[PDB]
Amino acid sequence: YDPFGGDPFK
Amino acid sequence: DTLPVAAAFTETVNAYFKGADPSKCIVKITGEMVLSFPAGITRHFANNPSPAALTFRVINFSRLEHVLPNPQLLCCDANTKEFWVNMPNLMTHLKKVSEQKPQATYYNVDMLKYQVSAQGIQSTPLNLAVNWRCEPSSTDLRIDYKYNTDAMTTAVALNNVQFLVPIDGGVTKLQAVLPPAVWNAEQQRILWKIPDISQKSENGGVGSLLARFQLSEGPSKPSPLVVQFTSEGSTLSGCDIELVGAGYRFSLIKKRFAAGKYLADN
Ligand SMILES: [Zn+2]
Ligand SMILES: [Zn+2]
Ligand SMILES: [Zn+2]
Ligand SMILES: [Zn+2]
Ligand SMILES: [Zn+2]
Ligand SMILES: [Zn+2]
């Protein structure tokens, strides 16, 4: 499970 | 250069309600604190075998019982707790994952697992109260819910909320449903879906689900209502995180919570 549902950095 | 890092608090609220009696409500909230690092780090750490110390503080830490820190990266004061991350074990770990997941753009790592001290129905974001009236060939169901701001640090919507309840007794037809529901004949269950519940909802966040069932092999035995919902923007614990020292900045701090095991008996 990924709490960021995607890249938090960009 | 100064390294971007990210952070997430993710909390699960388990709740069990018994008819209309709040005293009989059992609540258990758990959570994880996760840090995230961008790929670049591997290269960055190759540059420096003595990087700047990753040190942070958890705010509102006293609101947590049962705290397990990552054994490979931590653990060896009143309302704040501070941590110095083990850099050689983190560098090691992150190298290993990067080598196995080379196309990964970021790496999540579990830092803290915990419980949140919860005091009954007050700690519960969706107050629930169910009543059944079970007749030999009839059955009336009522669910009363109230969105509860007190449960969360900042007032945030509950999303994708589902109310599922199994109906015994051999249902043949349902009448007087409000708001509209879906009947699953195969599992013998009813499902209500509400996309959003908040203060800015249709009714202040407070409302009822009604249904009547006709039976052929009655009467029906009351079953647990199961509930689902998620939420972004706020914790239940009231925790936040701060970086202490130089060398890193937070690019993003994700806070969110979700119904885990969330039930209502008659
Ligand atoms: Zn660098
Ligand atoms: Zn301290
Ligand atoms: Zn590892
Ligand atoms: Zn995890
Ligand atoms: Zn626990
Ligand atoms: Zn939505």
Author numbering:
A (entry chain B): 639 to 648
B (entry chain A): 558 to 633, 639 to 828
Paper's wording?
Src homology 3 (SH3)-domain growth factor receptor-bound 2-like (endophilin) interacting protein 1 (SGIP1) and its splicing variant, SGIP1α, are brain-specific homologs of FCHo1/FCHo2. The μHDs of SGIP1 and SGIP1α, which are identical to each other, are highly homologous to those of FCHo1/FCHo2. The μHD of SGIP1/SGIP1α also binds to the DPF motif-rich region of Eps1519. Thus, the SGIP1/FCHo1/FCHo2 μHD is a domain designed for recognizing the locally ordered structure formed by the two consecutive DPF motifs.
We next crystallized the complex between the SGIP1 μHD and two short μHD-binding Eps15 fragments containing two DPF motifs derived from the high-affinity μHD-binding site, Eps15-640–649 and Eps15-645–654. In the two structures, the two DPF motifs are recognized by a continuous cleft on the μHD. The two DPF motifs in the two structures adopt type-I β-turn conformations, and each is stabilized by two sequence-specific intramotif interactions. In our complex structures, the two DPF motifs are intimately packed against each other through hydrophobic interactions between the side chains of Phe in the N-terminal DPF motif and Pro in the C-terminal DPF motif. This arrangement of the DPF motifs brings the hydrophobic side chains of all of the Pro and Phe residues of the two DPF motifs together on one side, allowing their extensive recognition by the continuous hydrophobic cleft of the μHD. Two conserved Ala residues, Ala563 and Ala565, of SGIP1 are located at the bottom of this recognition cleft. Ala563 contacts the side chains of Phe in the N-terminal DPF motif and Pro in the C-terminal DPF motif, while Ala565 contacts the side chains of Pro and Phe in the N-terminal DPF motif. In the two structures, the two DPF motifs bind to the same recognition cleft on the μHD. However, the positions of the C-terminal DPF motif relative to the recognition cleft slightly differ between the two structures, probably due to differences in the lengths and the amino acid sequences of the linker region between the two DPF motifs. Nevertheless, the key interactions for DPF motif recognition by the μHD are essentially conserved in the two structures (see below).
